[PDB]
C-alpha cells in the first residue's frame, strides 16, 4: 500500500469534494426592497412576503440541474431571520407572509429530504440590526448568534455545511467563532465549515479570493491558515494556496448565476449563459475547486425559469462531454508502473476505488495510449487519489498522428496542481496516441482517473 | 421538366409544410382561474393580472426549441379579449393588469418581430361571453368578430396563420366565415387559415381528428372538404385523408405539452417527457403534418422551464439525430432514372432545389446503395416534391450485409404515403447496402430526400 504526502483530506472534506456542486439560496427581506443586495437591518419585516414559496420548485430545478447539496441564507447581515427564532422579532415571525405564522428553513430541509439532498446553513457572522440595538455589545451578540445557531443545528435536521460569510466580520475574534465552533461540531459532527477570516482554525473549507467563479491556476489543496486570516494580503494563497501550506483546507469557489447576489427582475436578462457556466465549472471543478452556484428565489419565492433551464443544460452538456473517454479501448504502455493492481489501465476502467501508481521514491511516469482507431477530442480531465495528498507537481499531456513526432498541447503543457480534478479545454486535435507526461511530484502518482473527450454541441 | 399529379399545395401551403413545428400559448382569463381550461365567460376581468409578463421569455424558449412560429389566443370561447378592442370592455382594457392600460397581443408581436419568428392568432369563433348577451344573434355576432377581425389582421404586423377552431362553432354557417375570411385573406395574403367546419371551403389546412399529436398513417395532404364540414362522422378523411380527396388541405397536428392546454402547476409534474414528444413528433412532422405545440405561459408570463428543456432536448435529439445521413458515399443504382439532372445521388446530396425523379409512365422503381464500410441504423426518413402532388402510394425498405439476402424492415414494409417527410424509426440493424423499394403510385417517383440514421442517446 501506498503511504500519504504531505497533509491529507478529512472524511468531511472528501465528502464536500465529492459534491462536485453545491447550490446557494439567496433569499430574504431584501428580496422585497428595489434592487437591494446589502440591507440595513431597517426594513420592516412586513414586507416579507413571498406570494408562492414553493422550496420543492427549488430542488427540481437542482435535480435537474445534478446538484446534491443545497445552502440557504437563513439570515444575511441585514439579520433577518428566515425561522421563528426565540431569540429576535425581526423574522418570520412578524412578516406578513403567512401571517407570520411562516418558516421557511423549515420548508427548505423539508424539501431537501424530500429530494434526498443535502441542506446547508448560511448565518450571517456579521449582523447590521443587532448593531443597531443600543445595547449591542460583540460579548452579547455572540450569545445571541449561539442561540440561534443552536436553534438552527438542532432543530432542523442534518446540516452539511454552515457558512460564514467574512464581509463585516473584522470586529468578530478567534474565541467567538471558538465557542460558535464547538456548538456545530457537537450538533452537526458531518457539516462542513466554510470559515473566512478569524475563523481560520475551525474552516473545513476556505475562500478563493473572488466572487468572478475562477479558483487559481494552479489550485492547492493546502495553504497556510493565516491566509485565511489576513485575508487582504494573500489572494494568492487563498486563490492560488500552497503545496507547501501548513493547513489542508481546500478552496470552494462561490459564484452567482446572476450580476447580483439577490433576486432583481431587471436582471432576468443577464443570467448566465450555459457557455459561460461551462467555464466557471472548468474554472472550479476542473480546478481542484468545489463550485457553490447560487440562484436567487424571487418574490414568488420561486427560482425563475431561466435560471433553472440555463443549469439545467449545464448539466446536459456535461454529461454529453464526459459520457465517452476516448482513451478507452488503448494499449497502454507505461514506465515507473508498481503492480498489477496499480496499472495505469485503472485510470480508463471506470471504478470508484481503482487507480494507476508509481513506484515508491520515483516520481516520474510515462504513459502512452495507443488508440485502436484515431480521435478527435478537444478536452481532458485528470483525478488524483487525493487521500494521499497533493503528489504530483507537474505534468503534461502530447499526441500523435504520424507516429513520428509528438506533439505538445499548449493548453496542458507543463500544469502543476491534480487534485480531486483538473479539466483542460483544448483546440480540437486528432490523434492515434496520446501522452501523458508526469513529469514532477514531491512522491509517486497515485492517479484514478485520465480522460479525453469530445466536447458537447451544447456548448 | 416533370407535371405536378393531381392536387397541388399553394405558395401558402408550401411556407407552412417547412415550418415543420409552430407553437401554441394558450393564455388568458383561465389561467388566473383555479385549474378551468373552458372560461364560461362570467369571471371577472379583473383577476387576469400576469405580475411578469414576458414574451421575450416565450420566444427564446422557441429559439431554443427551433420553433419558428407562434400561435396566441387572443381569445379563447371565455371571450375574454388580450388586446384593448374597441368593440368589447371583456378585455384587457379592465384588467387588474397594468390598470387596464396593457396589450398582450402586441407584446406577443413585438417579440415575435424582434426574434424574427413568425406570429398568428388564434381568434376564438365560439363565444361564450357574447352569448351571455340578451342581445345576441348569429348576424350581430359575424359583425362583432369581423370588427375584431379586422383590428388583429391591420395594426399587429404581418400575421402567419389565423385559427378557427371549431369547437360549439357549428351554429356559425358558410357565409360568416366567408365574410371572416375576406378580411383575413385581403388584409393578409401570405396568412394560413385553420379552419374547421363550416369554414371547410376557406381552410388551407385541416384538423386531424385527435389531440393525442398522432396524424395517419397513412396520411394525404388530400381530403374530400365535406370532411372537414362534418369533422364528428369523418375521423379517417381528417386524420387519413383520402388519396382521391376533392380538395388540398393538409393536416395540422395539435397537442399540447401538458396535460391541460393551460397553465395549472398541479401539471408541472405532468409534462410530456423527451421521449413523448420524439414519439409526437414522429407522428406528426414524420407523418406528412405539422405539429403545434401548445406551451401554456403562468400566472407570471413566463414559460416554464420543464416546458423548455424537454422542447430544448427534443431539438438537441432530432439535430444529433439526423446531423448525418448514414448513406451518404454510397454508389448508387437505380432502374427508371430521368436523366443525370434528376439522378438517385440527388436523393442524398442535402440540397433543396434537387431530386430524384422517374421516367413519364412508369410508377415504380429501385435505387440500391452500396456502403463503403457497413453502417448501423434505426432510423429512416423520406421527402417528396410535394409541389408536384402525392405521386408515390407504395413503398418498402430492404438492407443486406453478405449480399446474398435482401433483407426486410417490418417496421418499412408497404408504407403509403409520403408526402412532405416520412419518418420510420425500427429496431436496429447493421448493413452494408439498402434498397428504397418505390412500389407503385399515380405517377413517377419525386424525392427530394432520402436516408437512414443513428437516432441520438437523448432519446
Ligand atoms: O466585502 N467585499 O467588498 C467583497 C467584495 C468582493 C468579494 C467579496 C467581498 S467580501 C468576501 O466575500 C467572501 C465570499 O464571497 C467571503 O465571505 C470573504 O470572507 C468576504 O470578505
Ligand atoms: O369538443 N371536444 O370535446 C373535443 C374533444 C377532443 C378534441 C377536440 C374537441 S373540439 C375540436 O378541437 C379541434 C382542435 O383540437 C378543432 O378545433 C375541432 O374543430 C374541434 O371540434
Redesign the interface.
Known sequence: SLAPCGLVPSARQLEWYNREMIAFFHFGINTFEEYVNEGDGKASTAIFNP?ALDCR?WM??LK?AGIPAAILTAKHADGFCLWPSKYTDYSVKNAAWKNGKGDVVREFVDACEEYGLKAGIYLGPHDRHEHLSPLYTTERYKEYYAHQLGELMSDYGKIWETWWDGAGADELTTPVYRHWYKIVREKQPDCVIFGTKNSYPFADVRWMGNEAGEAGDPCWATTDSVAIRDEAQYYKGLNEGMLDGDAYIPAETDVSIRPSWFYH?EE?SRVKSVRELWDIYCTSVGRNSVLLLNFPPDR?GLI???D??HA??LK?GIDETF?TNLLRGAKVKATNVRGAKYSPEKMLDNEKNTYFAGKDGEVKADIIFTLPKTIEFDCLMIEEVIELGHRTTKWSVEYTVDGKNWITIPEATDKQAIGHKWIVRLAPVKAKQVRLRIQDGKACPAIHTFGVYKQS??F
Do not use: G, M
Open positions: 406570494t420548485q427540481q430545478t435537474a427582475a432576468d414568488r425563475h425559469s431561466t433553472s433551464l439545467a443544460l446536459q459520457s454541441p451544447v
